[PDB]
Ligand binder design. Structure first.
Ligand SMILES: c1ccc(N2CCNCC2)cc1
Lengths: 300, 237
């Protein structure tokens, strides 16, 4: 189990770790988060008490270094940093644990929620979507726009998701216009899976990462990307049987985890109604359709 | 965006544009089978593609063979329309290609957009006008060429005959839409109006009779009466 120590908590902030969150008061003796499960990516995110605008946070993997948080009073945010002196870091952490000034990552033993949300998410792929190569961790916030959004303005601070556009020369073979537009299998399997992503694990990883940025930061272009990657599968007549089964599981846990009160904005009525009731794969998402109909029957 | 009353004179500016109407592409008669079931039999159709400024009508005849062995023909008809419009544009010299194409039914937007991805600078637009171009098959010579065709065929007509020698394209379009609206509301009466006087003939290379200016005002007045009337007989007013 790993640890993300905090230098201090100078400003009142709600701190999130994965799907957990807790309130820290201004100048409360908080010095970080312990017992973080190794083997998964994680995200630690922040919303200031004073300005609910700008949720922001850091994707990280504790196997890739020793990381800590320290407030910056000039830039006004909790920053993630790497400590390269490992003896210094162990000593700092051990002191903070002895004085019990850390919250414990509160994973219930029965609980596979985080695993199921991050199954295919790799830190190495995150870092290609979020370009900031000097750091091992990746910053995201509410306002970051996607590469495709900028096509329709600062490139260094963009989310470089894979561009998907159903009315593009990439999606549509000359001579197969009606075929390729009504049955996107060519685009999914040849262009995207074989051409760009290489395998469905990398595809599902981007999809899961887009959902999580949408949910934790209300990042609107992430939500667009999540829905686009769902729709491309559902609108393909020919999808590997194992991909459909795994998609159903993926979506099931995203819908289960979504806050009930955020459904109105984070869920696109047209994509979901199409995918569950009209698409080629309308009969292939049994778990997702059952939880959708029992939790958000209004959207449908 | 959408074409409507507020931007109606754009049609007659000097930016090349085409209206595309697909309402006569896929045409059927419905009948009973020997077993007493119902079946359709396709008949020849046409794409109605019209330059409103010049009166140029590129009439692409859709021969029934194009449907043979195909499924979901009403959906296929929109993509076949799109493929043929795209082929037409590609066949024109660059300086003759349209800058906008206006589809009379919104279901043509995606098929046309997809077929025209090679032409990002051609705007594909819908319209809020309820234009009467379905009545094109009530023009005798157009109906005649469609029904006689034994193979796919493109036929090039001026739908304004020689009108532009005397009137503007705005006035020519208004006359055309009035004639077509009349033919759509009551074909028999409309045609009676247009032909009742044997002395006014249709030139061999024209679609409509050779009315003088004064005769056109009479005709146009009679067509308005018809449309208001039939609106009477229809709503009882
Ligand atoms: C499309 C292009 C040209 C024409 N005409 C041919 C007869 N002369 C006037 C121009 C018709 C349709």
């Amino acid at each position: 189990m790993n640890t993300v120590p905090f230098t201090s908590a100078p400003i009142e902030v709600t701190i999130g770790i994965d799907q957990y969150s807790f309130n820290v008061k201004e100048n409360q003796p908080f010095h970080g988060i312990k017992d973080i499960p190794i083997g998964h990516v994680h995200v630690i995110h922040f919303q200031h008490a004073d300005n609910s605008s700008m949720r922001y946070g850091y994707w990280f993997d504790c196997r890739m270094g020793n990381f800590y948080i320290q407030y910056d009073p000039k830039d006004g945010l909790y920053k993630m940093m790497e400590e390269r002196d490992g003896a210094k870091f162990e000593n700092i952490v051990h002191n903070f644990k002895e004085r019990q000034m850390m919250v414990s990552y509160p994973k219930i033993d029965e609980d596979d929620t985080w695993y199921n949300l991050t199954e295919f998410v790799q830190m190495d792929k995150i870092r290609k979507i979020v370009r900031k190569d000097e750091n091992q961790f990746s910053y995201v916030d509410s306002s970051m726009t996607t590469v495709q959004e900028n096509e329709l303005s600062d490139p260094a601070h963009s989310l470089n998701y894979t561009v998907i556009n159903f009315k593009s020369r990439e999606a549509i073979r000359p001579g197969h216009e009606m075929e390729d537009f009504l049955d996107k299998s060519y685009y999914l399997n040849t262009v995207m899976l074989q051409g760009i992503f290489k395998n469905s694990s990398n595809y599902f990883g981007e999809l899961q990462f887009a959902f999580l940025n949408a949910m934790f930061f209300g990042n609107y272009g992430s939500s667009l990307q999540w829905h686009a990657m769902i729709e491309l599968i559902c609108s393909s007549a020919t999808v590997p049987k194992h991909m459909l089964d795994k998609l159903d599981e993926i979506l099931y846990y995203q819908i289960k985890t979504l806050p009930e009160q955020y459904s109105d904005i984070l869920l696109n009525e047209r994509v979901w109604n199409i995918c569950l009731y009209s698409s080629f794969q309308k009969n292939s998402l049994h778990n997702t359709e059952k939880i959708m109909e029992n939790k958000y029957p209004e959207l449908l | 965006g959408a074409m409507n009353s507020s931007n109606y004179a754009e049609l007659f500016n000097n930016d090349i544009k085409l209206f595309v109407d697909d309402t006569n592409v896929y045409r059927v008669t419905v009948h009973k089978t020997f077993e007493g079931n119902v079946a359709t039999k396709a008949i020849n159709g046409c794409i109605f593609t019209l330059n409103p400024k010049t009166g140029h009508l590129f009439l692409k005849i859709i021969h029934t063979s194009v449907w043979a062995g195909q499924k979901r023909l009403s959906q296929l008809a929109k993509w076949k329309t799109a493929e043929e419009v795209s082929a037409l544009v590609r066949s024109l010299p660059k300086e003759e290609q349209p800058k906008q194409i206006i589809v009379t039914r919104k279901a043509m937007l995606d098929p046309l957009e997809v077929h025209m991805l090679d032409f990002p600078n051609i705007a594909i637009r819908p319209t809020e006008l309820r234009l009467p171009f379905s009545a094109a098959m009530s023009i005798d010579k157009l109906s005649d060429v469609v029904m006689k065709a034994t193979e796919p065929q493109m036929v090039l007509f001026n739908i304004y005959d020689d009108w532009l020698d005397r009137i503007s394209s705005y006035t020519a379009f208004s006359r055309l839409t009035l004639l077509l609206r009349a033919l759509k509301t009551n074909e028999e009466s409309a045609k009676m109006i247009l032909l009742s006087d044997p002395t006014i003939t249709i030139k061999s290379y024209h679609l409509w009779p050779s009315f003088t200016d004064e005769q056109w005002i009479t005709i146009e007045s009679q067509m308005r009466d018809l449309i208001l009337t039939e609106y009477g007989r229809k709503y009882n007013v």
